[PDB]
Structure 1
Amino acid sequence: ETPVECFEPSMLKKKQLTVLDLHPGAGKTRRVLPEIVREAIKTRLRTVILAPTRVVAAEMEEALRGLPVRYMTTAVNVTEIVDLMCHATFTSRLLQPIRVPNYNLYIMDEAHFTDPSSIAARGYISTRVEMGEAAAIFMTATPPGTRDAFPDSNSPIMDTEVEVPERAWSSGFDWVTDHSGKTVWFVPSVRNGNEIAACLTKAGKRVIQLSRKTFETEFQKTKHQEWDFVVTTDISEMGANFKADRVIDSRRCLKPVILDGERVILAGPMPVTHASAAQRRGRIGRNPNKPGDEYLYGGGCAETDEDHAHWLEARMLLDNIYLQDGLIASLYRPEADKVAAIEGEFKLRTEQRKTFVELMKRGDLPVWLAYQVASAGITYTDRRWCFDGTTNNTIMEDSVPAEVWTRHGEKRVLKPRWMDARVCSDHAALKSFKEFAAGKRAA
C-alpha cells in the first residue's frame, strides 16, 4: 500500500506488490534496476521489465548490458530469463491467443502512466500477484492519489504561476522568447502543440514537437544542443529526459469522456492531475549542481473522477484477455474506483472478440470505438459504419465535411455511426481514420 523509498530483496517474494518511489539522485535506471535484475537472476525468477516508451526501454537495455535480458520491441509471439518490453507491447501480448509466460516478477517503470494499455497491464499484474503467482514492483515518483504537485528535486526549482499562452500570440508574452536557454512546454493536445510550435518557429525558435505517434523518432532530435523549445503532450510525463532549464506548463489536458454511453468527446482543456503536474515539473531541477531551473505554470490541479474513458477502456481490454479457469483480471485497487463496470461486463463472444482486437491492432482505432463496432456484430473489413451515421457525426476537414473515396469506388462524407473525437483530433489522426474508412488499409 504505502510507497517505499528504496529496493530491498524481500520485495521479490510472491504476493508482494510494492510501489517504489525513489528519491532524486538514486539512479533508478543505471543503479537500482540492475540491482533488482541481478537479484532476480540470482533467485532464478522469470522476470519481465515494462518500460512506458521504446525510448525508456532503450535506456534500460543500455543500463542492463551484459545481463541476460531480451528486449522485445514488438508484440510478436515469443516462446533469456529476463524479458524487456513496453507497457503497450505487454498488453498487446496478453490479447494474443497465446499464453504469456508465467512470470513470477513484474517490474513496471513509470507506473503512473494512465493510458489504457498501462492501466490494463497494472490490473493483470496486480491480479497475478494477489493470486500468489508473482511479485511486482511499480516504480513511480507520483503514486496514485498523490496530491503534491511540487515534490523534491536534485536542485531547487523556481516555481511561478503565470499566464501561459493557449493559442498563437503576436505580442504580450516576451518572457517566453527572451529566454536564452532550453524550454520544455507541455500542451494539452497535438493541435494546440502545432499552433504553439508554429508561433515559436515564426519567432525564430528551433522547436521539436513530441506526441505519442511521433515520440520515438522525434525524441532522438532532442539529444543535441540543437533546439530551443520542446513542445510536447503529456507523453513526456513518462520518463522523458531533457537537458532543459525551464518548463512552461499549461497545467491543462484533454479528457476523453464517454457521454451517455453513445460517443467520446475530448473534454477540456481542463486542469491536470497533481501527479501530471509533478511529472511535468519533474523534467527539470535534475542537476544537483545546477540551480535556477524554472517551472512556470498556468493554473491549478484537479483530480480525475470516474468519467475519464481510459479506465473503462482498460476494463474492456481485461475482459477480453483470458486467464486460467476463465478468470478476468481486476484493475489495480487504487484505480478500481475510477470505473463502475464489473469484471466481465465487456467480455465478447469469440468471433466479436477477434474483431475487437483486429480494430485495435490492425485498424488503429481507440479501444472504446473498436468495442462499439465489434459488439454490434460488424466484421473488420465492413467499413459501412464509417459513413451511415447521423449528420451530427460528420467529421469536418478545413471547415467542410471530410470526404473519402471507398475501395468500392464511391465518394462518401465521413459520418461514423459512433463518434469518437480521438479519430479526428489532429491531422495525423484524421488521415489515419480516413485511410481506415476508405477500406484501403488493412494495415
Structure 2
Amino acid sequence: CFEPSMLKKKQLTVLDLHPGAGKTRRVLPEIVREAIKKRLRTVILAPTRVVAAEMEEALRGLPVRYMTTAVNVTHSGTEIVDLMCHATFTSRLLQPIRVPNYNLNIMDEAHFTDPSSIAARGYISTRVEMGEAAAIFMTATPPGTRDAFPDSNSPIMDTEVEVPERAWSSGFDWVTDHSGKTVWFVPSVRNGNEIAACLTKAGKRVIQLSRKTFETEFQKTKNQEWDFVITTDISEMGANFKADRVIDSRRCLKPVILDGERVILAGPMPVTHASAAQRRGRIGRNPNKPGDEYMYGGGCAETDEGHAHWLEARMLLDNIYLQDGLIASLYRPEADKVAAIEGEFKLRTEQRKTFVELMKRGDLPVWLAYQVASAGITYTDRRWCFDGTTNNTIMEDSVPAEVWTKYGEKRVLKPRWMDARVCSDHAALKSFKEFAAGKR
C-alpha cells in the first residue's frame, strides 16, 4: 500500500500490486491528497489521453491541473498538482519550455515501453538519486518481471492453445463459438486487419485498436455493440474493457537497429512476461465474476533486450538538460536493454530543435528523426527521402511508392535512412508520403 513516508525526497517506490488491485482508482487519489496536504509540487503522468480522461473522474474535486485537451474542466489557480501524458512530459523536457522541478513524480502504468516513457523514468529516477525528488512508479509489472500469471481479483482460466495468426476456416471453433466479449492481442496492425476481416466474415462485430487510432476507436468499445476487440500492445497500458475473454497471440514485433544504419521490424516473436501479464490482466478484474478466460498461443521471452525503444530512449535522454553537462541514466532495472555510450546522442541547440520538430510535427520515429537531425539537415529539407540506395525503396502494393515532391516532380520513395516503422501499415505509409511531399 501507500505510506506518506514514500513522499520523502530520495524515495523511489514501485507500487506493484497485481492487475486490478486498485492502483489507478484507489491508491492514486490517496497519494494525491497526501501530496497536497504536504504542499508537494506534484506531476501525475498518464500513459494515454484516454487514461488521463479517466483519472479526472477518480481525482474529481481535487485541485489538479490537466495539461491535456482530453479533459474538459475550468482550472482554478490553487493547483500545485499537474497531470499530463508520459510523452508530454518528455517532450516538454526536450523543448526550451520550463517544467517545474517536481517534488513528487507519479507515473501510472510505469511499464509502458514507449521511448518517451522509458526516458521519463530515466530522468525521474536520476532526479530522485540526486536527492531532488520523490517518485512513485505504479505498475503491476515492473521491469524484469518473470511472472506472466500474477494474482487477479477473480480466478482466471488459463489455457495454452494454438491461436490463429492468419485467416482460418476450420480447426479453431473455440474462437467463434464463444458467446461473450473477447479482447485479442495481435503483433501488428496488418495482422489484426486479417484476423478482423476473417471474424467479420464469420458474422462477428469487430473493433480494431492501435496506437494512432486508440482515442477514436476506444470510445467505440463503449458506444457500440461488439464481439471482438482486435488490438496491438497499446491496450497493455491501463485499457479497461468489459470483456470475459482474452485471446493472446503472445507475439509482438521488435524494432531492431541493424548495423546502426537501418531499423527493421523483427518477428513476430514472443512477448515479455510483463506484456503477457498485462494482456491477461485485461480480464479477471471483477471479483464477482470468476472464470474469465485467457487463451495464449506461445511462450514469453526477454524481447526487450536489444529492442530499439531503449536506444531511442537514450537519444531522448541525452538531449534533456539535467544539470550542467550531466546526463540522466536509464532507470536501473532497464538500463541493460541497450548497448550505448551515455551522451553519444547529445545534440547542439539547433540540431536538437530539428530533432524535436521531426518527432513532433514530423511524426517520425525517434531513431529516424535522430539520423536526419544529426546529419545537419533542416526540418523542411526532404531531399533525403529520395536519395537512398535502391535497397531502401519503399513499396506499396508490390510497386515502388511514389509522391510528388514539393518541387512538383514525381519521385520514388527511397529514403537515405530506412526505418520500417514508416511503412509498416497503410496509415504509416500515407503519413510518410505526406512528409516526403513536404505537406507537413
Asked whether the 8 Å contact 2:384–2:415 carries over to 1, the reply is yes
1:60 equivalent to 2:55? Answer: yes
Deviations 1:136-171 (A, max 9, x none): 000011111111111111111111111111111222
TM-score (normalizing by structure 1): 0.96
- Structure 1 pair 417–164 and aligned structure 2 pair: CA distance change class (3 A): same
Paired with 2:339 and 2:71, the residues of 1 have a C-alpha distance of 33
Asked whether the 8 Å contact 1:207–1:227 carries over to 2, the reply is yes
Asked whether the 8 Å contact 1:356–1:374 carries over to 2, the reply is yes
Deviations 1:355-386 (A, max 9, x none): 11111111000000000011111111111110
Asked whether the 8 Å contact 1:128–1:134 carries over to 2, the reply is yes
- Structure 1 pair 120–144 and aligned structure 2 pair: CA distance change class (3 A): same
Deviations 1:217-273 (A, max 9, x none): 111111256100000000000000111111100000000000010100000000000
Deviations 1:301-329 (A, max 9, x none): 00135421000000000111112323221
Count, aligned residues? 436
Paired with 1:204 and 1:135, the residues of 2 have a C-alpha distance of 52
The Cα of 1:429 is off from its aligned counterpart by 0.4
Asked whether the 8 Å contact 1:112–1:144 carries over to 2, the reply is yes
The Cα of 1:297 is off from its aligned counterpart by 0.5
Asked whether the 8 Å contact 2:21–2:152 carries over to 1, the reply is no
What secondary structure is seen at the aligned counterpart in 2 of 1:295?
strand
Paired with 1:224 and 1:27, the residues of 2 have a C-alpha distance of 25
Paired with 1:211 and 1:16, the residues of 2 have a C-alpha distance of 35
Paired with 2:312 and 2:191, the residues of 1 have a C-alpha distance of 25
1:233 equivalent to 2:232? Answer: yes
- Structure 1 pair 155–398 and aligned structure 2 pair: CA distance change class (3 A): same
The Cα of 1:74 is off from its aligned counterpart by 6.2
The Cα of 1:426 is off from its aligned counterpart by 0.7
RMSD of Structure 2 on Structure 1 (CA): 1.9
Alignment of 1:318-333 (within 5 A): 318-333=317-332
TM-score (normalizing by structure 2): 0.96
The Cα of 1:21 is off from its aligned counterpart by 1.1
- Structure 1 pair 10–60 and aligned structure 2 pair: CA distance change class (3 A): same
- Structure 1 pair 89–283 and aligned structure 2 pair: CA distance change class (3 A): same
85-94 vs 334-343, which moves further: 334-343
Alignment of 1:136-151 (within 5 A): 136-151=135-150
22-31 vs 138-147, which moves further: 22-31
Paired with 1:89 and 1:172, the residues of 2 have a C-alpha distance of 46
Asked whether the 8 Å contact 2:50–2:70 carries over to 1, the reply is no
Asked whether the 8 Å contact 2:104–2:134 carries over to 1, the reply is yes
2:71 corresponds to which residue?
76
Asked whether the 8 Å contact 1:41–1:81 carries over to 2, the reply is yes
What secondary structure is seen at the aligned counterpart in 1 of 2:346?
coil
1:242 corresponds to which residue?
241
Paired with 1:21 and 1:223, the residues of 2 have a C-alpha distance of 28
- Structure 1 pair 318–374 and aligned structure 2 pair: CA distance change class (3 A): same
- Structure 1 pair 51–305 and aligned structure 2 pair: CA distance change class (3 A): closer
Asked whether the 8 Å contact 1:157–1:292 carries over to 2, the reply is yes
What secondary structure is seen at the aligned counterpart in 2 of 1:14?
coil
Deviations 1:170-213 (A, max 9, x none): 22212111111000000001111111111111111111111100
Paired with 1:409 and 1:26, the residues of 2 have a C-alpha distance of 58
The Cα of 1:110 is off from its aligned counterpart by 0.5
Asked whether the 8 Å contact 2:270–2:303 carries over to 1, the reply is no
2:359 corresponds to which residue?
360
What secondary structure is seen at the aligned counterpart in 1 of 2:222?
coil
Alignment of 1:48-197 (within 5 A): 48-73=43-68, 80-197=79-196
The Cα of 1:25 is off from its aligned counterpart by 5.6
Asked whether the 8 Å contact 2:24–2:108 carries over to 1, the reply is no
The Cα of 1:102 is off from its aligned counterpart by 1.2
1:46 corresponds to which residue?
41
Question: Structure 2 regions of 5+ residues with no counterpart?
Answer: none
Asked whether the 8 Å contact 1:29–1:59 carries over to 2, the reply is no
- Structure 1 pair 63–77 and aligned structure 2 pair: CA distance change class (3 A): closer
- Structure 1 pair 24–345 and aligned structure 2 pair: CA distance change class (3 A): closer
Deviations 1:376-410 (A, max 9, x none): 11111111110110110111100100010112110
What secondary structure is seen at the aligned counterpart in 1 of 2:223?
coil
Paired with 2:258 and 2:274, the residues of 1 have a C-alpha distance of 25
Question: Structure 1 regions of 5+ residues with no counterpart?
Answer: 1-5
Identity %: 98
- Structure 1 pair 75–124 and aligned structure 2 pair: CA distance change class (3 A): farther
Asked whether the 8 Å contact 1:109–1:140 carries over to 2, the reply is yes
Deviations 1:97-129 (A, max 9, x none): 123101000000010001101000000100111
Paired with 2:235 and 2:304, the residues of 1 have a C-alpha distance of 23
Asked whether the 8 Å contact 1:258–1:309 carries over to 2, the reply is yes
Asked whether the 8 Å contact 1:155–1:288 carries over to 2, the reply is yes
169-178 vs 84-93, which moves further: 169-178
The Cα of 1:291 is off from its aligned counterpart by 1.4
Deviations 1:278-299 (A, max 9, x none): 0000000111111111100000
167-176 vs 137-146, which moves further: 167-176
Paired with 1:85 and 1:342, the residues of 2 have a C-alpha distance of 30
Deviations 1:25-52 (A, max 9, x none): 6422332111100000000000000011
Question: Which of 6, 14, 19 is the aligned partner of 1:24?
Answer: 19
Alignment of 1:278-297 (within 5 A): 278-297=277-296
- Structure 1 pair 77–197 and aligned structure 2 pair: CA distance change class (3 A): closer
